[PDB]
């Protein structure tokens, strides 16, 4: 398989992190130094990493049995399918938030004998000591439903921690999976813009975020679909690096240079310290030009 | 160019009707002599139809400026990246639900300025006189929104219809947009019956149960509309295979319209009874008069 990139339009398709359309792309010298996305995370030629899924329908979801304690009400959690979790090996389910230091608010339906309005539940996931999903168990706040009840789980909104620790939402930070006990296992690498005056692109939706750090925005490495598509194709990377266009649709003309290392990112060169790819128009498609050497500089892009 | 599908696992990919993982397949003597779902339908040479988005983001979501009135509040719908939405383009919105006669009650958020539960409702969407999709608004009970507030909606689950005309929900049938829809399928004829791929959803006394029928995985639509692969037969003739042992589990034949059929054996489940986790791999262009091998139990 020759490798390739969608052939369609960046508008039409929706964020790796949230379940919502991209209506814009930024760079970040603040928040771009290095991220550790665990959603959106897949190689050039295939392989899934984090707790990536290949369908949005899994993404921001959680599934598990209520369990009732002393300390709280929460869910002993499993795959979205039903089927086990492994504790103590992927850093959660797959399609689990990657969202950290901030409070979840769902929505949670009974798989079982749904019947209406009393089996949705809505309820706070708080990321403090019982968040502990790599051990495969989080508490949740206001869950009303009864022990062993089979819950799927559908992220709402996002807000500042209950504790009070913080009061604004940052979308940069990814949660302590193992909480305070221990590093979680199988992490998608941290990832850094390799080249010469690069910058690793974001993908921006809009979402219900209180106070956040970039307002109602959550940035990904790569569109949703572009996951589905690498992990279809499985086509081998034979260059350091992807030289791709972003494209007007309708001419085909070039309106900026960007590179796709393996690790499943992509970097832009801003235009002298500019936004970079922020004012390029959102309708485009990336398409691959050749693979090119790490070192290939790209020709700035945007304004200045 | 060669015509292909995803190489993925159908228990990993989408329903196109609503945004839930795949763990099923049936066939219905009943409810498939004739289908025409507005969402999932796509040609094999990659040409969006209905109300199809390219991206399950868009699927099964409404977005409006809220109106007041005295028969009830409501929605001027917009295209959920919040462009103004035209009648006579389309049956309504792209990603517009397409389950007919049942209650919707779904989710709304405030796009702008979202302050937390108080700019999140939980609304009450009936397909009645004023479910006026394609025109471009629907009323909605139990908003209390503010006039001309931006609001983007997600479905929750759906029930039977609030005026009691039926006690159960069809997932089958499609809304009534008005007086622009993706065309009728039909079993083409010899046995061969639409394969309908099912996903669990909260449904208040389905007639499936907690089930919603479509014809493609969400996946495959956006496949086809990156791969535009001139159709070059009456049917591409699949293989479901198990992605392991690289053995063929069935025979199905995927038509132009961007559908699947196949026969099930002395009149049984199809392909109920295949595992979940296989993958469909095209083999080649056949014609309509290729005689697909039977699947499943009798
Ligand atoms: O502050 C971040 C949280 O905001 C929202 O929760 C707040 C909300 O539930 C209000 C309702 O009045 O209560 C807040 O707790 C207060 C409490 O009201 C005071 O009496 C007490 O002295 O202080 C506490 C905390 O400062 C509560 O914080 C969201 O629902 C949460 O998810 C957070 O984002």
């Known amino acids: 398989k020759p490798f390739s990139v969608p052939n369609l339009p960046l508008n039409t398709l929706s964020n790796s992190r949230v379940p919502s359309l991209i209506n814009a792309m930024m760079i970040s010298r603040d928040h771009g130094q290095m991220v550790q996305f665990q959603n959106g995370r897949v190689t050039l030629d295939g392989q899934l990493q984090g707790t990536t899924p290949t369908s949005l329908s899994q993404l921001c979801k959680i599934r598990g049995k209520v369990f009732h304690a002393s300390g709280?009400?929460?869910?002993?959690?499993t795959e979205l399918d039903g089927?086990?979790?492994?504790?103590?090996?992927?850093p959660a389910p797959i399609g689990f938030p990657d969202i950290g230091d901030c409070d979840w608010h769902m929505s949670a339906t009974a798989t079982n004998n749904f019947t209406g309005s009393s089996n949705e539940?809505?309820?706070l996931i708080?990321?403090?000591?019982?968040f502990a999903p790599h051990l495969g168990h989080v508490q949740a706040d206001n869950l009303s439903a009864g022990a062993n009840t089979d819950l799927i789980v559908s992220l709402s909104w996002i807000s500042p921690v209950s504790d009070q620790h913080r009061h604004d939402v940052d979308p940069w930070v990814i949660p302590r999976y193992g909480s305070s006990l221990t590093e979680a296992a199988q992490l998608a690498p941290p990832i850094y813009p390799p080249g010469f005056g690069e910058a690793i692109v974001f993908f921006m939706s809009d979402f219900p975020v209180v106070s956040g750090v970039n307002g109602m925005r959550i940035p990904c490495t790569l569109p949703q679909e572009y996951v589905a598509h690498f992990v279809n194709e499985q086509a081998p990377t034979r260059g350091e690096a992807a030289l791709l266009?972003?494209?007007?649709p309708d001419t085909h003309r070039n309106l900026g240079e960007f590179k796709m290392?393996?690790?499943?990112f992509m970097t832009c060169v801003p235009n002298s310290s500019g936004s970079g790819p922020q004012t390029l128009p959102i309708n485009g498609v990336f398409?691959?030009?050749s693979w090119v050497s790490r070192f290939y500089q790209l020709k700035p892009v945007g304004t200045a």
Do not use: C, R, W
């Open 72 to 77: 709280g009400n929460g869910l002993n959690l």
């Open 83 to 90: 089927s086990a979790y492994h504790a103590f090996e992927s």
């Open 121 to 123: 539940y809505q309820i």
């Open 126 to 130: 708080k990321q403090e000591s019982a």
């Open 245 to 248: 266009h972003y494209v007007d």
């Open 261 to 264: 290392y393996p690790e499943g």
């Open 287 to 289: 398409t691959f030009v």
